[PDB]
Amino acid sequence: ESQRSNSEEKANFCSTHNDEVYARFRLQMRVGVRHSPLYTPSNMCMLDIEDSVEDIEESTEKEYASTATGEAAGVNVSVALVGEGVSIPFSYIGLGFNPSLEDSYLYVNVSSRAPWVKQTSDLSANGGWGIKQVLEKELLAIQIGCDNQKFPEEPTTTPPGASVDRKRNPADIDFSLLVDPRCVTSVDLHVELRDACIDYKQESPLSLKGKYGDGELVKKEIKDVGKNHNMCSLNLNPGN
Amino acid sequence: ESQRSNSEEKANFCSTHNDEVYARFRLQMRVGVRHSPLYTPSNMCMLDIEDSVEDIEESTEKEYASTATGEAAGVNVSVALVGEGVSIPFSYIGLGFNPSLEDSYLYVNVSSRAPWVKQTSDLSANGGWGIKQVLEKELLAIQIGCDNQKFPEEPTTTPPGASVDRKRNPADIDFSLLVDPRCVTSVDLHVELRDACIDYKQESPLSLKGKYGDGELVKKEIKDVGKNHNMCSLNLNPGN
Ligand SMILES: *[C@@H]1O[C@H](CO)[C@@H](O[C@@H]2O[C@H](CO)[C@@H](O)[C@H](O)[C@H]2NC(C)=O)[C@H](O)[C@H]1NC(C)=O
Ligand SMILES: *[C@@H]1O[C@H](CO)[C@@H](O[C@@H]2O[C@H](CO)[C@@H](O)[C@H](O)[C@H]2NC(C)=O)[C@H](O)[C@H]1NC(C)=O
Ligand SMILES: *[C@@H]1O[C@H](CO)[C@@H](O)[C@H](O)[C@H]1NC(C)=O
Ligand SMILES: *[C@@H]1O[C@H](CO)[C@@H](O)[C@H](O)[C@H]1NC(C)=O
């Protein structure tokens, strides 16, 4: 009759905070990778998470961006979640990659902070102003580059106003996906941004989803790549 | 009467491989950190693990080096384990760091592959040639730099033959520790290199230990920094 499975810490938090609304963002992505002839195998991994605040000329509101970057296997990824008046910061990025020459899949997780671990912004404030800002304005921007790879160039130049129950039917998240086709052969993507306690609520206006290629596949394959890939991850101090 | 506590996977492996000798290296290190006035807070983490093989002019033997590097909080660390004729590759490096301006501790784990996860070199080969090579020749080299920080410069130039039971009494590991005192205010270090199954053996010639500052402290504090520090780690694919 009810299908949820959560930690005690999650259930206790949600039972106790039913009038609040916290957003939770989760991304899983599979990137098909290929290398230039010059690429040498490397276990190197670079991870970063940065939050930025930009004044909006039009408004009293700020633009809040959380940007997760990861670089491994000759490919660099950028995931940016951007809101107006609403900040949803990332707390985790994890990469799964094969260090070799061959074509392979690079796996990316990005997540925002679980409200039970540390409390995020309460979007119920001001009559649910934050919720509306997310539904109307939130942007996701994904970029996948191929640095610092050098590819073969032929010799010449010299480089020697209605509210909706979206728990049932999620709205589409607004996202762009920019890739460099020299090193990126495919992308599968599943992304969701929703009330972190949506499991303990009958209905909710705050549920957004994005998909590219076989989202369901990556959502599952990504839990099973530790056996055959390098894994690296950055987890932000709970508290900052 | 017997005080060991290990996973079933470890106990089953060691019971089954009592005639083999596998080495296991583990390092825990605490680095006192300080920043230049220009340093801006950063969650960035860079990790790498590289294995190298250098021909020795004198010998038929090769020099095998495993090098773990990590960079975070304005400090870059290098841990290199070097053997002659013996390769003991790293499979894991983990960093715990505070991204802020303030002085803080950076925590480093480096470990080599657990033989139960994947089999490493059997040092029992050739009459225990490998064991002797480790006891006699193994080198550990630790370097801690402060890049890419720029520090205040006064304006002028412009930058605008006996076998021993060492299970009881470990031999000293031969190590160097090079630090840049501009960004490094202290070092506490515990390091051990020993028969990975030494728990299941009455005696063993293969046990080496290194200590600097309060080794015992760091060995313990490092298990409890997740609560108040960024954590990042690189774990190599079991299999390569
Ligand atoms: C991405 O995140 C998922 C968790 O959502 C990770 O899943 C764990 O994966 C390990 C081994 O890969 C399993 O043993 C665990 O059971 C998984 N946990 C859960 C909750 O299912 C996955 O590892 C991550 N992938 C990357 C590349 O970081
Ligand atoms: C270094 O390695 C140790 C394991 O030897 C890590 O210890 C775990 O730490 C977490 C939280 O920090 C604890 O909840 C676990 O119980 C610890 N495991 C064990 C086996 O004790 C420690 O996290 C690592 N430190 C860094 C900076 O990577
Ligand atoms: C990838 O790296 C290159 C070179 O550093 C950089 O110019 C490019 O903007 C990066 N792209 C992404 C997606 O971060
Ligand atoms: C730290 O970084 C600097 C600049 O990249 C480099 O010159 C130095 O050798 C590095 N030191 C270590 C310990 O890796």
In ligand 3, the atom with minimum distance to the C-alpha of A69 is 14
Helix (H), strand (E), coil (C) string for chain A: CCCCCCCHHHHHHHHHCCCCCCEEEEEEEEEEECCCCCCCCCCCEEEEEEEEEEECCCCCCEEEEEEEEEEECCEEEEEEEEEECCCCCEEEEEEEECCCCCCEEEEEEEEECCCCCCCCCCCCHHHHHHHHHHHHHCEEEEEEECCCCCCCCCCCCCCCCCCCCCCCCCEECCEEEEECCCCEEEEEEEEEEEECCHHHCCCCCCEEEEEECCHHHHHHHCCCCCCCCEEEEEECCCCC
Q: What are the boundaries of each domain within chain B?
A: 1-240
Phi-psi region of A218 (alpha: psi -120 to 50; beta: other; left: phi over 0): alpha
Nearest partner of A91 among A130, A51, A54, judged by Cα: A51
Q: Give the resolution in Å.
A: 2.2
- CB of B76 within 8 A of CB of B70? yes
Q: Is A101 on the interface with B (CB under 8 A)?
A: no
Q: Which long-range contacts (CB under 8 A, 24 or more apart) does A146-153 make?
A: A146/A74, A146/A75, A146/A76, A146/A180, A146/A182, A146/A183, A146/A184, A147/A71, A147/A74, A147/A76, A149/A35, A149/A36, A149/A38, A149/A39, A149/A74, A149/A182, A149/A183, A150/A36, A150/A38, A151/A36, A151/A182, A152/A36, A152/A37
Residue whose tokens read 């899949």:
A105
The backbone torsions φ and ψ at residue A148, rounded to the nearest 5 degrees and listed phi first, read -105, 40
Q: Do A45 and B50 touch (CB under 8 A)?
A: no
Pick the closest to residue A39 from A140, A146, A113, A130 (CA basis): A146
Other CB atoms within 10 A of residue A153 CB: 9
Closest CA to A172 of A193, A186, A188: A193
Ligand 4 contact, B50 CB (< 6 A)? no
Kindly state the tokens that stand for B92.
């894991």
User: What's the CA gap between B149 and B40, in Å, rounded?
Assistant: 10
Q: CA B211: distance to chain centroid? A: 12
Pair A80, A141: CB distance under 8 Å:
yes
What's at B165, amino acid-wise?
D
Q: What is the rounded radius of gyration, in angstroms, for the C-alpha atoms of chain A?
A: 20
Helix, coil or strand: residue B63 = strand
Interface contact B227, partner A, CB < 8 A: yes
What is the spatial distance between Cα A12 and Cα A113, in angstroms, rounded to a whole number? 17
